[PDB]
């Protein structure tokens, strides 16, 4: 009935303070082609829209992301996942992303705007050295033209 | 990364 709609931590102070500061900055100064904010009452659960970067095979696509913070933020990275289906060697069928700053390169200096810029950069420059879909990372290296035809077809079919 | 798929 009465539900706190968030995490039972002992210290929500550091996380919530930093999250409201990030919310305000990203509404003032959103990254190019990107948007992000809380879904509802829980400032630890955001939603993001990303347009496929111009010049990329994802161009004209509209991609939605789920962003979940924990009470350890900014010392632990947020969890970020595509909801839109996407054809990309570093993003798996459930939208899990293989990006350095979302695991071992995370730094308290990084903000959620930066995560979105990097995600945009990862869309225009896949990282086949750390693949999350083997056939797609393989096709990206051996048959690039077929990889682009598929990423374009998937953008048109799933991201509109 | 966790979540690898062929």
Coordinates of N, CA and C in Angstrom, one line a residue:
Chain A
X1 N 0.8 -1.2 0.0 CA 0.0 0.0 0.0 C 0.9 1.3 0.0
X2 N 1.5 1.5 1.1 CA 2.5 2.6 1.3 C 3.9 1.9 0.9
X3 N 4.4 2.3 -0.3 CA 5.6 1.8 -0.9 C 6.6 2.9 -1.2
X4 N 7.9 2.7 -0.7 CA 8.9 3.7 -0.9 C 9.4 3.9 -2.3
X5 N 9.1 3.0 -3.2 CA 9.5 3.3 -4.6 C 10.9 3.6 -4.9
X6 N 11.8 2.8 -4.4 CA 13.2 3.0 -4.5 C 14.0 2.0 -3.7
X7 N 15.3 2.2 -3.6 CA 16.1 1.2 -2.8 C 16.2 1.5 -1.4
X8 N 16.2 0.5 -0.6 CA 16.4 0.6 0.9 C 17.9 0.5 1.1
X9 N 18.5 1.7 1.2 CA 19.9 1.8 1.4 C 20.0 2.5 2.8
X10 N 21.2 2.6 3.3 CA 21.3 3.4 4.5 C 21.7 4.8 4.1
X11 N 22.4 4.9 3.0 CA 22.7 6.2 2.5 C 22.3 6.5 1.1
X12 N 21.1 7.1 0.9 CA 20.6 7.5 -0.4 C 21.1 8.9 -0.6
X13 N 21.7 9.5 0.5 CA 22.2 10.9 0.4 C 23.1 11.1 -0.8
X14 N 24.2 10.4 -0.9 CA 25.2 10.7 -1.9 C 24.6 10.4 -3.3
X15 N 23.9 9.2 -3.5 CA 23.4 8.9 -4.8 C 22.3 9.9 -5.2
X16 N 21.3 10.1 -4.4 CA 20.2 11.0 -4.8 C 20.7 12.4 -5.0
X17 N 21.6 12.9 -4.2 CA 22.1 14.3 -4.4 C 22.7 14.4 -5.8
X18 N 23.6 13.4 -6.2 CA 24.3 13.4 -7.4 C 23.3 13.2 -8.6
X19 N 22.3 12.4 -8.4 CA 21.3 12.1 -9.5 C 20.5 13.3 -9.8
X20 N 20.0 14.1 -8.8 CA 19.3 15.3 -9.1 C 20.2 16.4 -9.8
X21 N 21.5 16.4 -9.4 CA 22.4 17.3 -10.1 C 22.6 16.9 -11.5
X22 N 22.6 15.6 -11.8 CA 22.8 15.1 -13.2 C 21.5 15.3 -14.0
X23 N 20.4 15.2 -13.3 CA 19.1 15.4 -14.0 C 19.0 16.8 -14.5
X24 N 19.4 17.8 -13.7 CA 19.2 19.2 -14.0 C 20.2 19.6 -15.1
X25 N 21.5 19.1 -15.0 CA 22.4 19.4 -16.1 C 22.0 18.8 -17.4
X26 N 21.4 17.6 -17.4 CA 21.1 17.0 -18.7 C 19.8 17.6 -19.3
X27 N 19.0 18.3 -18.5 CA 17.9 19.0 -19.1 C 18.3 20.4 -19.6
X28 N 19.3 21.0 -18.9 CA 19.9 22.2 -19.4 C 20.7 21.9 -20.6
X29 N 21.6 20.9 -20.6 CA 22.6 20.7 -21.7 C 22.6 19.3 -22.2
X30 N 21.5 18.9 -22.9 CA 21.4 17.5 -23.3 C 22.5 17.2 -24.3
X31 N 23.0 16.0 -24.3 CA 24.0 15.6 -25.4 C 23.3 15.6 -26.7
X32 N 24.0 15.8 -27.8 CA 23.4 15.9 -29.1 C 22.6 14.6 -29.4
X33 N 21.3 14.8 -29.9 CA 20.5 13.7 -30.4 C 20.1 12.8 -29.2
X34 N 20.1 13.2 -28.0 CA 19.8 12.4 -26.9 C 18.9 13.1 -25.9
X35 N 18.2 12.3 -25.1 CA 17.3 12.8 -24.1 C 17.3 11.7 -23.0
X36 N 17.0 12.2 -21.7 CA 17.0 11.2 -20.6 C 16.3 11.9 -19.4
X37 N 15.4 11.1 -18.7 CA 14.9 11.5 -17.5 C 14.1 10.4 -16.8
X38 N 13.7 10.7 -15.5 CA 13.0 9.6 -14.8 C 11.7 9.2 -15.4
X39 N 11.4 7.9 -15.3 CA 10.1 7.4 -15.9 C 8.9 8.0 -15.0
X40 N 9.0 7.9 -13.7 CA 8.0 8.3 -12.8 C 8.5 8.9 -11.5
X41 N 8.1 8.3 -10.4 CA 8.5 8.8 -9.1 C 9.9 8.5 -8.6
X42 N 10.5 7.5 -9.2 CA 11.8 6.9 -8.7 C 12.9 7.5 -9.5
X43 N 13.6 8.5 -8.9 CA 14.8 9.1 -9.6 C 15.9 8.1 -9.9
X44 N 15.8 6.9 -9.4 CA 16.8 5.9 -9.7 C 16.5 5.1 -11.0
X45 N 15.3 5.3 -11.6 CA 14.9 4.6 -12.8 C 14.7 5.7 -13.9
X46 N 15.6 5.8 -14.9 CA 15.4 6.7 -16.0 C 15.1 6.0 -17.3
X47 N 14.8 6.8 -18.2 CA 14.5 6.4 -19.6 C 15.2 7.3 -20.5
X48 N 15.7 6.8 -21.6 CA 16.5 7.6 -22.5 C 16.0 7.3 -24.0
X49 N 16.0 8.4 -24.8 CA 15.8 8.3 -26.2 C 17.1 8.7 -26.9
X50 N 17.5 7.9 -27.9 CA 18.7 8.2 -28.7 C 18.3 8.1 -30.1
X51 N 18.6 9.1 -30.9 CA 18.5 9.0 -32.4 C 19.8 8.4 -32.9
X52 N 19.7 7.5 -33.9 CA 20.8 6.8 -34.5 C 21.7 7.9 -35.1
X53 N 23.0 7.9 -34.7 CA 23.9 9.0 -35.1 C 23.9 9.2 -36.6
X54 N 23.8 10.5 -37.1 CA 23.8 10.8 -38.5 C 25.1 10.2 -39.2
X55 N 24.9 9.8 -40.4 CA 26.0 9.1 -41.1 C 26.2 7.7 -40.8
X56 N 25.5 7.2 -39.7 CA 25.7 5.8 -39.3 C 24.6 5.0 -40.0
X57 N 24.8 3.7 -40.0 CA 23.8 2.7 -40.5 C 22.5 2.8 -39.6
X58 N 22.6 3.4 -38.5 CA 21.4 3.5 -37.6 C 20.6 4.8 -37.8
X59 N 21.1 5.6 -38.7 CA 20.4 6.9 -39.0 C 19.0 6.8 -39.2
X60 N 18.2 7.7 -38.7 CA 16.8 7.7 -38.8 C 16.1 6.7 -37.8
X61 N 16.9 5.9 -37.0 CA 16.3 5.1 -36.0 C 16.1 5.9 -34.7
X62 N 15.1 5.4 -34.0 CA 14.8 6.0 -32.6 C 15.0 4.9 -31.7
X63 N 16.0 5.0 -30.8 CA 16.3 4.0 -29.8 C 16.0 4.4 -28.4
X64 N 15.4 3.5 -27.6 CA 15.1 3.7 -26.2 C 16.0 2.9 -25.3
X65 N 16.4 3.5 -24.2 CA 17.3 2.9 -23.3 C 16.6 3.0 -21.9
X66 N 16.9 2.0 -21.1 CA 16.6 2.0 -19.7 C 17.8 2.2 -18.9
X67 N 17.8 3.2 -17.9 CA 18.9 3.6 -17.1 C 18.5 3.4 -15.6
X68 N 19.1 2.5 -14.9 CA 18.9 2.3 -13.5 C 20.1 2.6 -12.8
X69 N 20.0 3.5 -11.8 CA 21.1 3.8 -10.8 C 20.9 3.0 -9.6
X70 N 22.0 2.8 -8.9 CA 22.0 2.2 -7.5 C 22.4 3.2 -6.5
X71 N 22.2 2.8 -5.2 CA 22.6 3.7 -4.1 C 24.1 3.9 -4.0
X72 N 24.9 3.2 -4.8 CA 26.3 3.3 -4.8 C 26.8 4.4 -5.8
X73 N 25.8 5.0 -6.5 CA 26.2 6.0 -7.5 C 26.8 7.2 -6.9
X74 N 27.8 7.9 -7.4 CA 28.5 7.7 -8.7 C 29.7 6.8 -8.6
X75 N 29.8 6.0 -7.6 CA 31.0 5.1 -7.4 C 30.8 3.7 -8.1
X76 N 29.6 3.3 -8.4 CA 29.3 2.2 -9.2 C 28.5 2.7 -10.5
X77 N 28.8 2.2 -11.7 CA 28.2 2.7 -12.9 C 26.7 2.4 -12.8
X78 N 25.9 3.2 -13.5 CA 24.5 2.8 -13.7 C 24.4 1.6 -14.6
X79 N 23.3 0.9 -14.6 CA 22.9 -0.1 -15.5 C 22.2 0.5 -16.7
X80 N 22.6 0.2 -18.0 CA 22.1 0.8 -19.2 C 21.9 -0.3 -20.2
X81 N 20.6 -0.3 -20.8 CA 20.3 -1.4 -21.7 C 19.4 -0.8 -22.8
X82 N 19.6 -1.2 -24.0 CA 18.7 -0.9 -25.1 C 17.4 -1.7 -24.9
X83 N 16.3 -1.0 -25.2 CA 15.0 -1.7 -25.3 C 14.6 -2.0 -26.8
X84 N 14.8 -1.0 -27.6 CA 14.8 -1.2 -29.0 C 15.7 -2.4 -29.4
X85 N 15.3 -3.3 -30.2 CA 16.1 -4.2 -30.9 C 17.1 -3.4 -31.8
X86 N 18.4 -3.9 -31.8 CA 19.4 -3.3 -32.7 C 20.5 -4.3 -33.1
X87 N 21.0 -4.1 -34.3 CA 21.9 -5.0 -35.0 C 23.3 -4.4 -34.8
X88 N 24.1 -4.9 -33.9 CA 25.4 -4.3 -33.5 C 26.2 -5.3 -32.8
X89 N 27.5 -5.4 -33.1 CA 28.3 -6.5 -32.5 C 28.5 -6.4 -31.0
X90 N 28.3 -5.2 -30.4 CA 28.5 -5.0 -28.9 C 27.2 -5.0 -28.1
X91 N 26.1 -5.3 -28.7 CA 24.8 -5.2 -28.0 C 24.0 -6.5 -28.3
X92 N 23.7 -7.2 -27.3 CA 23.1 -8.5 -27.5 C 21.5 -8.4 -27.6
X93 N 20.9 -9.6 -27.8 CA 19.5 -9.6 -28.1 C 18.6 -9.0 -27.0
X94 N 19.1 -9.0 -25.8 CA 18.3 -8.4 -24.7 C 18.8 -6.9 -24.4
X95 N 19.6 -6.4 -25.3 CA 20.0 -5.0 -25.1 C 21.2 -4.7 -24.2
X96 N 21.8 -5.8 -23.7 CA 23.0 -5.6 -22.9 C 24.1 -5.0 -23.7
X97 N 24.8 -4.0 -23.2 CA 25.8 -3.3 -23.9 C 27.2 -3.7 -23.4
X98 N 28.1 -3.9 -24.3 CA 29.6 -4.1 -23.9 C 30.3 -2.8 -24.2
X99 N 30.5 -2.0 -23.2 CA 31.2 -0.8 -23.2 C 32.0 -0.6 -22.0
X100 N 33.3 -0.2 -22.2 CA 34.3 -0.2 -21.2 C 33.9 0.7 -20.0
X101 N 33.4 1.9 -20.2 CA 33.1 2.8 -19.1 C 31.8 2.3 -18.3
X102 N 31.1 1.3 -18.8 CA 30.0 0.8 -18.0 C 30.5 -0.4 -17.2
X103 N 31.7 -0.8 -17.3 CA 32.3 -1.8 -16.3 C 33.6 -1.3 -15.7
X104 N 34.7 -1.7 -16.3 CA 36.0 -1.5 -15.6 C 36.6 -0.1 -15.8
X105 N 36.1 0.7 -16.8 CA 36.5 2.0 -17.0 C 35.6 3.1 -16.3
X106 N 34.6 2.6 -15.5 CA 33.7 3.6 -14.9 C 34.5 4.4 -13.8
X107 N 34.2 5.7 -13.8 CA 34.8 6.7 -12.9 C 33.8 7.6 -12.4
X108 N 33.9 8.0 -11.1 CA 32.9 8.9 -10.5 C 32.9 10.2 -11.3
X109 N 33.9 10.5 -12.0 CA 34.0 11.7 -12.9 C 33.0 11.7 -14.0
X110 N 32.6 10.5 -14.5 CA 31.7 10.3 -15.6 C 30.3 10.6 -15.2
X111 N 29.5 11.2 -16.1 CA 28.1 11.5 -15.9 C 27.3 10.7 -16.9
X112 N 26.0 10.8 -16.7 CA 25.1 10.1 -17.6 C 25.1 10.7 -19.0
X113 N 25.4 12.0 -19.1 CA 25.6 12.6 -20.4 C 26.7 11.9 -21.1
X114 N 27.8 11.7 -20.4 CA 29.0 11.1 -21.0 C 28.7 9.7 -21.5
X115 N 27.9 8.9 -20.7 CA 27.6 7.6 -21.1 C 26.9 7.6 -22.4
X116 N 26.0 8.5 -22.6 CA 25.2 8.6 -23.8 C 26.1 9.0 -25.0
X117 N 26.9 10.0 -24.8 CA 27.9 10.3 -25.9 C 28.7 9.1 -26.3
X118 N 29.3 8.4 -25.3 CA 30.0 7.2 -25.6 C 29.2 6.1 -26.3
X119 N 27.9 5.9 -25.8 CA 27.0 5.0 -26.5 C 26.8 5.5 -27.9
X120 N 26.7 6.8 -28.2 CA 26.6 7.2 -29.6 C 27.8 6.9 -30.4
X121 N 28.9 7.1 -29.8 CA 30.2 6.8 -30.5 C 30.4 5.3 -30.7
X122 N 29.9 4.5 -29.8 CA 29.9 3.1 -30.0 C 29.0 2.6 -31.1
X123 N 27.9 3.4 -31.4 CA 27.1 3.0 -32.5 C 27.8 3.4 -33.9
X124 N 28.5 4.5 -33.9 CA 29.2 4.7 -35.2 C 30.6 4.0 -35.3
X125 N 31.1 3.5 -34.2 CA 32.4 2.8 -34.2 C 32.3 1.5 -33.4
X126 N 31.7 0.4 -33.9 CA 31.7 -0.8 -33.1 C 33.1 -1.2 -32.6
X127 N 33.1 -2.0 -31.5 CA 34.3 -2.5 -31.0 C 34.4 -4.0 -31.2
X128 N 34.8 -4.5 -32.3 CA 34.8 -5.9 -32.6 C 35.8 -6.7 -31.7
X129 N 36.7 -6.0 -31.0 CA 37.6 -6.7 -30.1 C 37.0 -7.2 -28.8
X130 N 35.8 -6.7 -28.4 CA 35.1 -7.2 -27.3 C 33.6 -7.5 -27.8
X131 N 33.4 -8.5 -28.6 CA 32.1 -8.7 -29.2 C 31.1 -9.3 -28.2
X132 N 29.8 -8.9 -28.4 CA 28.7 -9.5 -27.6 C 27.8 -10.3 -28.5
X133 N 27.9 -10.2 -29.8 CA 27.2 -11.1 -30.8 C 28.2 -11.5 -31.8
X134 N 28.6 -12.8 -31.7 CA 29.7 -13.3 -32.5 C 29.5 -13.2 -34.0
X135 N 28.4 -13.7 -34.5 CA 28.2 -13.6 -35.9 C 28.2 -12.2 -36.4
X136 N 27.7 -11.2 -35.6 CA 27.7 -9.9 -36.1 C 29.0 -9.2 -36.1
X137 N 29.8 -9.5 -35.0 CA 31.2 -9.0 -35.0 C 32.0 -9.7 -36.1
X138 N 31.8 -10.9 -36.4 CA 32.4 -11.6 -37.5 C 32.0 -11.0 -38.8
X139 N 30.7 -10.8 -39.0 CA 30.3 -10.2 -40.3 C 30.8 -8.8 -40.4
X140 N 30.9 -8.1 -39.3 CA 31.4 -6.7 -39.3 C 32.8 -6.6 -39.9
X141 N 33.6 -7.7 -39.6 CA 35.0 -7.6 -40.1 C 35.2 -8.3 -41.4
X142 N 34.5 -9.3 -41.8 CA 34.7 -10.0 -43.0 C 33.8 -9.5 -44.1
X143 N 32.5 -9.2 -43.8 CA 31.6 -8.8 -44.8 C 30.9 -7.5 -44.3
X144 N 31.6 -6.4 -44.5 CA 31.1 -5.1 -43.9 C 29.8 -4.7 -44.6
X145 N 29.8 -4.9 -45.9 CA 28.6 -4.4 -46.7 C 27.4 -5.2 -46.3
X146 N 27.5 -6.5 -46.0 CA 26.3 -7.2 -45.5 C 26.0 -6.8 -44.1
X147 N 27.0 -6.4 -43.3 CA 26.7 -6.0 -41.9 C 25.9 -4.7 -42.0
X148 N 26.3 -3.8 -42.9 CA 25.6 -2.5 -43.0 C 24.1 -2.7 -43.5
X149 N 24.0 -3.6 -44.5 CA 22.6 -3.8 -45.0 C 21.7 -4.4 -43.9
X150 N 22.3 -5.2 -43.0 CA 21.4 -5.7 -42.0 C 21.1 -4.7 -40.9
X151 N 22.1 -3.9 -40.5 CA 21.9 -2.9 -39.5 C 20.9 -1.9 -40.1
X152 N 21.0 -1.5 -41.3 CA 20.0 -0.6 -41.9 C 18.6 -1.3 -41.9
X153 N 18.5 -2.5 -42.4 CA 17.2 -3.2 -42.4 C 16.6 -3.3 -41.0
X154 N 17.5 -3.5 -40.0 CA 16.9 -3.7 -38.6 C 16.5 -2.3 -38.1
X155 N 17.2 -1.3 -38.3 CA 16.8 0.1 -38.0 C 15.5 0.4 -38.5
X156 N 15.2 0.1 -39.8 CA 14.0 0.4 -40.4 C 12.8 -0.4 -39.8
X157 N 13.1 -1.7 -39.4 CA 12.1 -2.6 -39.0 C 11.8 -2.5 -37.5
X158 N 12.8 -2.2 -36.7 CA 12.6 -2.2 -35.2 C 12.7 -0.8 -34.6
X159 N 13.3 0.2 -35.2 CA 13.6 1.4 -34.5 C 12.8 2.6 -34.9
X160 N 11.6 2.3 -35.5 CA 10.8 3.4 -36.0 C 9.4 3.4 -35.3
Chain B
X1 N 32.7 -8.8 -21.2 CA 31.3 -8.5 -20.8 C 30.5 -9.7 -20.6
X2 N 29.6 -9.7 -19.7 CA 28.6 -10.8 -19.5 C 27.5 -10.6 -20.5
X3 N 26.9 -11.8 -20.8 CA 25.8 -11.8 -21.8 C 26.1 -12.1 -23.2
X4 N 27.3 -12.8 -23.5 CA 27.7 -13.1 -24.9 C 26.7 -14.0 -25.5
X5 N 26.5 -13.8 -26.8 CA 25.6 -14.6 -27.7 C 26.4 -14.9 -29.0
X6 N 26.2 -16.1 -29.5 CA 26.9 -16.5 -30.8 C 26.2 -15.8 -31.9

